[PDB]
């Protein structure tokens, strides 16, 4: 869906009222094109350009690296313990456990490669 957008509404009455206003706008363009609105951009200026060429916020980057490393190590511990915590099947079959495997996703995708 390139060059498109998605406008979510609150309820059916809202989306129905907006669709009625849009078909009335189409009829207004059909009958009298002068009453139509004007589109105004929030015009980017040198403040916006120095915002784009502006350095990053050090505390924002610091809290970002902290929280993402925390959740990432949580994920990595959970995956390795789950895969090498001796997963057994329902009818008495045992999953093969190996030296430093932390990834059942890599078990299945390495079977997919081979």
């Amino acid at each position: 869906p390139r060059n498109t957008a998605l406008l979510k509404f609150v309820d059916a009455a809202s989306i129905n009222n907006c669709w009625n206003a849009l078909k009335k706008y189409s009829n207004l363009h059909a009958k009298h094109p002068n009453e139509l609105f004007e589109w105004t951009y929030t015009t980017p200026s040198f403040t916006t350009f120095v915002n784009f060429y502006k350095p990053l916020d050090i505390d924002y980057l610091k809290e970002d690296i902290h929280t993402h490393m925390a959740i990432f190590e949580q994920r990595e511990a959970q995956a390795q313990e789950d895969v090498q915590s001796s997963i057994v099947d329902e009818d008495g079959f045992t999953l093969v456990v190996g030296k430093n495997t932390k990834s059942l996703n890599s078990i299945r995708k390495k079977i997919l490669n081979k």
Partner: protein
């Protein structure tokens, strides 16, 4: 030329008059809109918008 306001597929025409330029011999921007149907939970009562401006 001024009566193109509705497509046979079900799309509508939204023209907008732009602010003029100091050295250009108003101009119209064309946007399209249609309701979008889906069984997704977070995609309830949505407007599929086509040709978004900058």
């Amino acid at each position: 030329i001024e009566d193109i306001s509705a497509m046979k597929n079900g799309f509508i025409v939204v023209p907008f008059k732009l602010p003029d330029h100091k050295a250009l011999p108003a101009s119209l921007h064309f946007m399209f809109a249609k309701r979008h149907q889906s069984s997704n939970s977070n995609e309830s009562d949505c407007l599929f918008l086509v040709n978004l401006p900058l």
